[PDB]
Coordinates of N, CA, C and O in Angstrom, one line a residue:
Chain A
X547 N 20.0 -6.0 24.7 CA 18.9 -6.7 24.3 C 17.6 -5.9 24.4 O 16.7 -6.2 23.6
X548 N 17.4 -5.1 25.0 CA 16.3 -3.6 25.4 C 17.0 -2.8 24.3 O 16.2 -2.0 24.0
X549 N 17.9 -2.7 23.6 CA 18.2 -2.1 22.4 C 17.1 -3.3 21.3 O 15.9 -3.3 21.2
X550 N 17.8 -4.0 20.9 CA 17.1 -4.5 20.2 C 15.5 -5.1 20.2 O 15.1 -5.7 19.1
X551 N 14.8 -5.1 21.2 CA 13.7 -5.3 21.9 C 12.8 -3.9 21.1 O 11.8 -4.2 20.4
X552 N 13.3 -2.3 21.1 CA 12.7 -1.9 21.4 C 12.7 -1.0 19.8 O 12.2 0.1 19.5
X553 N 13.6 -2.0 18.9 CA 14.0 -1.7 17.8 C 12.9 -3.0 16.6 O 12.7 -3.0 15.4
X554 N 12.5 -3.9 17.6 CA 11.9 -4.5 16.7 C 10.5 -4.0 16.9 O 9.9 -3.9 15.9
X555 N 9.9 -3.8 18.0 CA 8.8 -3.0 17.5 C 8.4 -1.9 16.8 O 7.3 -1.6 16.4
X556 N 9.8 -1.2 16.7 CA 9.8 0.1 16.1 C 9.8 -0.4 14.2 O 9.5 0.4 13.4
X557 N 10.0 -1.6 14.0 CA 10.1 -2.4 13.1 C 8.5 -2.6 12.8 O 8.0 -1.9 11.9
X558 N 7.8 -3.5 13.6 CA 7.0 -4.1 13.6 C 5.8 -3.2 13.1 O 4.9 -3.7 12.4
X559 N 5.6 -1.8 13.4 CA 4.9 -1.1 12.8 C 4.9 -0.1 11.6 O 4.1 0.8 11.2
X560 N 6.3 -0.6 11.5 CA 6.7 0.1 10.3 C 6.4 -0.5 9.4 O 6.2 0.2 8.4
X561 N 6.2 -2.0 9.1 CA 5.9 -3.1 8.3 C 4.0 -2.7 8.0 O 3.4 -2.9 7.0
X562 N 3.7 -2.2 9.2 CA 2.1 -2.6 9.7 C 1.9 -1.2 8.7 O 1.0 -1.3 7.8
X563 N 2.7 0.1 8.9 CA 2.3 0.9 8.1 C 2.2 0.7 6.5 O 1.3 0.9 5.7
X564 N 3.2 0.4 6.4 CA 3.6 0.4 5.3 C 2.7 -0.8 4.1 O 2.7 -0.5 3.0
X565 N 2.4 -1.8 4.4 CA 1.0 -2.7 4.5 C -0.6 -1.8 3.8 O -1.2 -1.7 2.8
X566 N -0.6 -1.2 5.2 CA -1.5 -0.4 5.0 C -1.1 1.0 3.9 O -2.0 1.7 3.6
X567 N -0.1 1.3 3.5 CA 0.1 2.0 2.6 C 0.2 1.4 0.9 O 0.3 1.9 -0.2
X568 N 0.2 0.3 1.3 CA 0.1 -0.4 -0.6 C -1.2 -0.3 -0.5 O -1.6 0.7 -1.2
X569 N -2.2 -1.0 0.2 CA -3.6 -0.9 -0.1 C -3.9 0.8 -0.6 O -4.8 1.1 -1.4
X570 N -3.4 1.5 -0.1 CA -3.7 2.8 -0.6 C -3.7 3.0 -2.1 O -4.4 3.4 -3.0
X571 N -2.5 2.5 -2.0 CA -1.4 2.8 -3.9 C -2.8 2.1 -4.4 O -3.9 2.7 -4.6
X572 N -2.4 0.3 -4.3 CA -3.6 -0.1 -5.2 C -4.7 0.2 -5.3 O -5.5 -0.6 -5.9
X573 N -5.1 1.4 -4.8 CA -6.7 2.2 -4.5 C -6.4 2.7 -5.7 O -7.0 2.3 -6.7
X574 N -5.3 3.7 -5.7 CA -4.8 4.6 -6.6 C -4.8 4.3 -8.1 O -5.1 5.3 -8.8
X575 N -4.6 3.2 -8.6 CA -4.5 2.7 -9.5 C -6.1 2.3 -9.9 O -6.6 3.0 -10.9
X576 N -7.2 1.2 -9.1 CA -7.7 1.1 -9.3 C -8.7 2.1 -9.5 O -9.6 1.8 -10.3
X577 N -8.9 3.5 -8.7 CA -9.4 4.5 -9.1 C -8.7 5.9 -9.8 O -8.2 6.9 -9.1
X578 N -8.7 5.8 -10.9 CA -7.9 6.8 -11.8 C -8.2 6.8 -13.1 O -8.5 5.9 -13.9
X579 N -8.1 8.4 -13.5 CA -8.7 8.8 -14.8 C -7.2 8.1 -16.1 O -6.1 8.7 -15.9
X580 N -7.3 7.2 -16.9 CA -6.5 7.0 -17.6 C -7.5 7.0 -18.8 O -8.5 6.2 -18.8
X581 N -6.9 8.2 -20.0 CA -7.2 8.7 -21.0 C -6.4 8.6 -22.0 O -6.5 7.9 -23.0
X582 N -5.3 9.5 -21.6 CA -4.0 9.1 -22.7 C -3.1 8.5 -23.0 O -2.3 8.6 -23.9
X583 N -3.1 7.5 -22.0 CA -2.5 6.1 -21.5 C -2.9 4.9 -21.7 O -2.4 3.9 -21.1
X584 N -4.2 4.7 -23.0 CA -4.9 3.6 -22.8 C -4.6 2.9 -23.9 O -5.5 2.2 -24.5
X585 N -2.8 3.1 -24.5 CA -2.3 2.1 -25.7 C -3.1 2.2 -27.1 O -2.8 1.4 -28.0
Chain B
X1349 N -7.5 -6.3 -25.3 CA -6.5 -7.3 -24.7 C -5.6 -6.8 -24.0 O -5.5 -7.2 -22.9
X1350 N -4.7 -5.8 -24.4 CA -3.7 -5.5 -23.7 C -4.8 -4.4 -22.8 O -4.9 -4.7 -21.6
X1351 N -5.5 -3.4 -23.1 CA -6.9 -2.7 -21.8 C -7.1 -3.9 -20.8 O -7.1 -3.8 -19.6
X1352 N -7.1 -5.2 -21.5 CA -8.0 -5.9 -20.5 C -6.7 -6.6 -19.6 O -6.7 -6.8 -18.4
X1353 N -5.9 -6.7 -20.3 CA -4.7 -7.3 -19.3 C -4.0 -6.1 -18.2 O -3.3 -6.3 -17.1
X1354 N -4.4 -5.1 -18.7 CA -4.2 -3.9 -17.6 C -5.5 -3.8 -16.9 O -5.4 -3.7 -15.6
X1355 N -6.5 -3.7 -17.2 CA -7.4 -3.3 -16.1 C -7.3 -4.4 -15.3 O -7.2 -4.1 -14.1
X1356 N -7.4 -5.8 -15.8 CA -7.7 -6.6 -14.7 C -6.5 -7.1 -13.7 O -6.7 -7.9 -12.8
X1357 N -5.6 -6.8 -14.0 CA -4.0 -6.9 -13.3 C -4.2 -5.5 -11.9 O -3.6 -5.7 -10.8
X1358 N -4.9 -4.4 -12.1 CA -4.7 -3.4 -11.2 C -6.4 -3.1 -10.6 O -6.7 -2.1 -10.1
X1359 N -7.2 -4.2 -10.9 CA -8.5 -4.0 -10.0 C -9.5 -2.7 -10.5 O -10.5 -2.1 -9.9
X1360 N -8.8 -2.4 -11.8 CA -10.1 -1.5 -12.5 C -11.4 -2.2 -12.9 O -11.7 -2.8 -14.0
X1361 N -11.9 -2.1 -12.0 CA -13.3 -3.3 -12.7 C -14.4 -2.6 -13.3 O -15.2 -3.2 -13.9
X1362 N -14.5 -1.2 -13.2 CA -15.3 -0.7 -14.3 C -14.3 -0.7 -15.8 O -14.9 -0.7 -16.9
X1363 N -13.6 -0.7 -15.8 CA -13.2 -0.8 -16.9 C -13.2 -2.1 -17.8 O -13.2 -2.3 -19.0
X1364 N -13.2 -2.8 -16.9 CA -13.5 -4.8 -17.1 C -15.0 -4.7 -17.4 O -15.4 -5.3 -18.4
X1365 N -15.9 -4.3 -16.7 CA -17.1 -4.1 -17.4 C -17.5 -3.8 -18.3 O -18.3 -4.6 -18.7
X1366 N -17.2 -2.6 -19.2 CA -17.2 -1.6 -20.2 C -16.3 -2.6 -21.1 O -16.8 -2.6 -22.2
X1367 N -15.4 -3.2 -21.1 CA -14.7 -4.1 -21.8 C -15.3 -5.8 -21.8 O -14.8 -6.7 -22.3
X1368 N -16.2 -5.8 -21.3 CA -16.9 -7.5 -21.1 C -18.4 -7.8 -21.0 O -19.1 -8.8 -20.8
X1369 N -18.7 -6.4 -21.3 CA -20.4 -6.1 -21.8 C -20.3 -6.4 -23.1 O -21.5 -6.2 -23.5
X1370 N -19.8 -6.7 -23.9 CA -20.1 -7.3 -25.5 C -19.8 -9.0 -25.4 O -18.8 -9.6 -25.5
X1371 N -21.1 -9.3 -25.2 CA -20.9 -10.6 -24.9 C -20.8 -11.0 -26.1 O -21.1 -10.4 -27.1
X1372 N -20.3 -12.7 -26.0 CA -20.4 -13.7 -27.3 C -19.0 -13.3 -28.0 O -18.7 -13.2 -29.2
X1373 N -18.2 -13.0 -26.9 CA -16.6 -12.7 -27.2 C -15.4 -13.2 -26.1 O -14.6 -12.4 -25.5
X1374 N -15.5 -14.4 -26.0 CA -14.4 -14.8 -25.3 C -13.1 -15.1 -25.6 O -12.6 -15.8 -24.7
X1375 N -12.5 -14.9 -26.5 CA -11.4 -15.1 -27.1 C -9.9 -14.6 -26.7 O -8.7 -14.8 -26.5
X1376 N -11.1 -13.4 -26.5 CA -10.0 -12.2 -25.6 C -9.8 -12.8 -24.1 O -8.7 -12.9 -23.5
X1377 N -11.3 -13.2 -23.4 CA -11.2 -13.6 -21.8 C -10.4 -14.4 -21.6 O -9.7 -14.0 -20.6
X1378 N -10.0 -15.4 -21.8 CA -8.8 -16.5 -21.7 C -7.8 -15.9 -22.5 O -6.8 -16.6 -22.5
X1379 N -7.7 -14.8 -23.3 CA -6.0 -14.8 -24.2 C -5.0 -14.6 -22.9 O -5.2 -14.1 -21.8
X1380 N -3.6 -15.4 -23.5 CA -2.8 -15.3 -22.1 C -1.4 -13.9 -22.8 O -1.0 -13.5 -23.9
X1381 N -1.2 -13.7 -21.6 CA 0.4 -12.3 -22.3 C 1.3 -13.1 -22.5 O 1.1 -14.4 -22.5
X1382 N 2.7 -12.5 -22.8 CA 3.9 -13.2 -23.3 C 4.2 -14.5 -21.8 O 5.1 -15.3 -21.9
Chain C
X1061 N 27.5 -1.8 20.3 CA 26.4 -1.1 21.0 C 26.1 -0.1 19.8 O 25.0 -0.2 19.1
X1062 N 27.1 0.8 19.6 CA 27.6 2.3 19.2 C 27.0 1.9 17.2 O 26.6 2.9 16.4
X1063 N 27.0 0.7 16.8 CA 26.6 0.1 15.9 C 24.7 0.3 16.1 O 24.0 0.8 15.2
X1064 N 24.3 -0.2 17.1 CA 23.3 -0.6 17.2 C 22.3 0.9 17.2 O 21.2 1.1 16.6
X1065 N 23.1 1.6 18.0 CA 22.3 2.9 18.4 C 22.4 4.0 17.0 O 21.7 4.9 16.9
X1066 N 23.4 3.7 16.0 CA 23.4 4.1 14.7 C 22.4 4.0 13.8 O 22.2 4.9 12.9
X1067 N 21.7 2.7 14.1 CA 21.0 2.1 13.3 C 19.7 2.4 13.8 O 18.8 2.2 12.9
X1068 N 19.2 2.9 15.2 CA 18.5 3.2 15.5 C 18.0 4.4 15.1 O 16.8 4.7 14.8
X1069 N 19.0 5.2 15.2 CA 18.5 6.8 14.6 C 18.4 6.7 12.8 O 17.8 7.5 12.0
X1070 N 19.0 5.6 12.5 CA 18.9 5.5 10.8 C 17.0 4.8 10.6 O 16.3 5.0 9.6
X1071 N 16.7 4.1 11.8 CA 15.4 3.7 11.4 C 14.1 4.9 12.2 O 12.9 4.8 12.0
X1072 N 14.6 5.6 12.7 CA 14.1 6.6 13.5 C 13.3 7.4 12.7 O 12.1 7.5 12.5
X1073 N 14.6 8.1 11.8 CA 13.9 9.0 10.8 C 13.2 8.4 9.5 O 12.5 9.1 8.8
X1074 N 13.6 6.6 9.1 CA 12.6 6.0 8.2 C 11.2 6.0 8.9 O 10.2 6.3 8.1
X1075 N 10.9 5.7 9.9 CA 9.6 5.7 10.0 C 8.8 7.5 10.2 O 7.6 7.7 10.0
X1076 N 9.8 8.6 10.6 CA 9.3 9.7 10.1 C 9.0 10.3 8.7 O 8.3 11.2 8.3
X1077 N 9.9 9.3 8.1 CA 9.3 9.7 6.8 C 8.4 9.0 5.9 O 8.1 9.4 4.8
X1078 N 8.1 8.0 6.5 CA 7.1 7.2 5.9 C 5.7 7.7 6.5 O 4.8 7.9 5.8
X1079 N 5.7 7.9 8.0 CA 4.4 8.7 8.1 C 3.9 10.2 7.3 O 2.8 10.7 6.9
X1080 N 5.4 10.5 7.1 CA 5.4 11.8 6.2 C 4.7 11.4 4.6 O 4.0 12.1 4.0
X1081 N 5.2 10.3 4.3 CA 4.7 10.1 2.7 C 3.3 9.9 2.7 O 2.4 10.3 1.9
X1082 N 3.0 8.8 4.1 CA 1.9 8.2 4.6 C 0.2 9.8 4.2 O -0.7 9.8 3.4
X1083 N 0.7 10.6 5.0 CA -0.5 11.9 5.1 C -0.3 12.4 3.3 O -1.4 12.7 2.8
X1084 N 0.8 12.5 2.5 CA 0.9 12.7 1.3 C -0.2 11.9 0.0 O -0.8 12.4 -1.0
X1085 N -0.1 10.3 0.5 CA -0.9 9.3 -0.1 C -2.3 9.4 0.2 O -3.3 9.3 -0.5
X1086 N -2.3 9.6 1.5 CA -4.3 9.8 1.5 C -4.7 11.6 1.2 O -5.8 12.1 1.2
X1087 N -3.3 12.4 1.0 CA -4.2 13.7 0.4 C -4.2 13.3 -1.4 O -4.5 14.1 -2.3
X1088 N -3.8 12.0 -1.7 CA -3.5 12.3 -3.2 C -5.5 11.1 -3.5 O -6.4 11.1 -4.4
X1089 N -5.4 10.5 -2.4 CA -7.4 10.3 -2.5 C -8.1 11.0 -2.6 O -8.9 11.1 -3.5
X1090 N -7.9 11.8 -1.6 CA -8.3 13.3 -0.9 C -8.9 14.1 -1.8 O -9.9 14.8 -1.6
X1091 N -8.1 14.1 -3.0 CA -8.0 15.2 -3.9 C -7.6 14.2 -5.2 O -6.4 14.0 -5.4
X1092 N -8.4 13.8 -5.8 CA -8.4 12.8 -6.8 C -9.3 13.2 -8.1 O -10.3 13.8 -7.8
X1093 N -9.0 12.8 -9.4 CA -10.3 13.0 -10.4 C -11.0 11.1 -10.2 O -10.3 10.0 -10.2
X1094 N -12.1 11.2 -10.2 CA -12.5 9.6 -10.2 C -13.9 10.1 -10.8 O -14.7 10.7 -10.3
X1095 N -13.8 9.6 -12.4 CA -15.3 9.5 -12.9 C -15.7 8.1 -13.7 O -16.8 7.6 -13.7
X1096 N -14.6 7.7 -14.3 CA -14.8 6.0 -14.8 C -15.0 5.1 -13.5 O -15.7 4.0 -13.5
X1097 N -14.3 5.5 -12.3 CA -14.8 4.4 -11.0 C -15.7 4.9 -10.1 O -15.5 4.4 -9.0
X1098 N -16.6 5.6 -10.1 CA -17.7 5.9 -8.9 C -18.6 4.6 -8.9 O -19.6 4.9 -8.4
X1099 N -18.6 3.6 -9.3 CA -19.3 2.4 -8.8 C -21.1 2.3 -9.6 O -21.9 1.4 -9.4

């Protein structure tokens, strides 16, 4: 149970990262040169 | 329409500007996609 | 057990590689063209 205890935190901020890693993406998108992509 | 269904789906808001500065055209602002 | 501690080293190196993608995504801001979004 100290296995799995120590596996869900390891969890818990992987969630926390990765969270904080879409707001990045969606940065990405919202700031970007689209030129020849604009249909 | 389809610019504006892409900019405003991904938070390009200058782009929604430059696209919604020609006022006395809402036709496009409410058109819905498939 | 031998299950659990498997799974441990399988999420071990996901979260090294997500910090790894992590420093990739803020060098791709970092180093960006942005002239239609400067505000």
């Amino acid at each position: 149970e100290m296995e799995i205890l120590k596996q869900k935190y390891r969890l818990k901020d992987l969630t926390f990262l990765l969270e904080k890693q879409h707001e990045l993406i969606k940065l990405i998108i919202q700031k970007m040169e689209i030129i020849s992509e604009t249909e | 329409k389809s610019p504006l269904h892409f900019a405003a789906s991904y938070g390009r808001i200058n782009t929604c500007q430059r696209l919604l500065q020609d006022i006395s055209d809402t036709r496009l602002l409410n058109e819905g996609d498939l």
